[PDB]
């Protein structure tokens, strides 16, 4: 995020870091329950990647993070790689998350819920702060 | 869902 700010630690408890086997953060995701993470299809997650829950500071390993293996990747069959449309994948965890103060689920909308243009929302992540 | 135990500060 460019021109954002540091979050309060633990205050976005559904936010996960998707890391490859070398430990490199390559994408975010959101816990929707103890067993499932929602991410983008174009992130290309495989069962060799790791879901890291409970993280705040990726350079300080004093925190009680949960490194969760991925059992299966469910890329939405409607994903279109050419247009990046329907850009959603579900990750079924091999090991369930243990919900806590710093690890818990985001709500899903109903398909009929409305979010008007002009509404102020929030986005979070460990993406670049400057390109 | 959706109600953090540690409240975000925006």
């Amino acid at each position: 995020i460019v021109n954002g700010e540091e979050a309060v630690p633990g205050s976005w408890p559904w936010q996960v870091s998707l890391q490859d086997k070398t430990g490199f953060h390559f994408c975010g995701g959101s816990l929707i329950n103890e067993n499932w993470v929602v991410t983008a299809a174009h992130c290309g997650v495989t069962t060799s990647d790791v879901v890291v829950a409970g993280e705040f500071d990726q350079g300080s390993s004093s925190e009680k993070i949960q490194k969760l293996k991925i059992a299966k990747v469910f890329k939405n069959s409607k994903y279109n790689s050419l247009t990046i449309n329907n850009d959603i994948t579900l990750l079924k965890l091999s090991t369930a998350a243990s919900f806590s103060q710093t690890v818990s689920a985001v709500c899903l909308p109903s398909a009929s819920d409305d979010f008007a243009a002009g509404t102020t929302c929030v986005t979070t992540g460990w993406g670049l702060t400057r390109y | 869902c959706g109600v953090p135990a540690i409240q975000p500060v925006l």
């Binding site: 975010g28 979070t124 702060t129 | -």
Partner: protein, 97 residues
């Protein structure tokens, strides 16, 4: 480029797909929602993470960070997967697995 160690946040507005198309044209599909162009931007490495809006007091997943400006321009809207267009598939997948 700078990657942060610490989790970042930003507040930003939703756009309408019609207005987003002034920036992105026919690249915008019904299963996308735009947000930003407001002095902040999602950027590389944010993909897959949340765009949340409060609905009846609970943070609700409205978007999944997807794509946008290759330089993360803060005057151009970001594009997110529109979760209301995708939530039936989520529920079906969870039920079947």
């Amino acid at each position: 480029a700078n990657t942060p160690d610490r989790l970042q946040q930003a507040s930003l507005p939703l756009l309408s797909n019609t207005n987003c198309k002034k920036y992105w044209g026919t690249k915008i599909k019904d299963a996308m929602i735009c947000a930003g162009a407001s002095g902040v931007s999602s950027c590389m490495g944010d993909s897959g993470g949340p765009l949340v809006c409060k609905k009846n007091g609970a943070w609700t997943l409205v978007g999944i960070v997807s794509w946008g400006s290759s330089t993360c321009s803060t005057s151009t809207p970001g594009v997110y997967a529109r979760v209301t267009a995708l939530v039936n598939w989520v529920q079906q997948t969870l039920a079947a697995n």
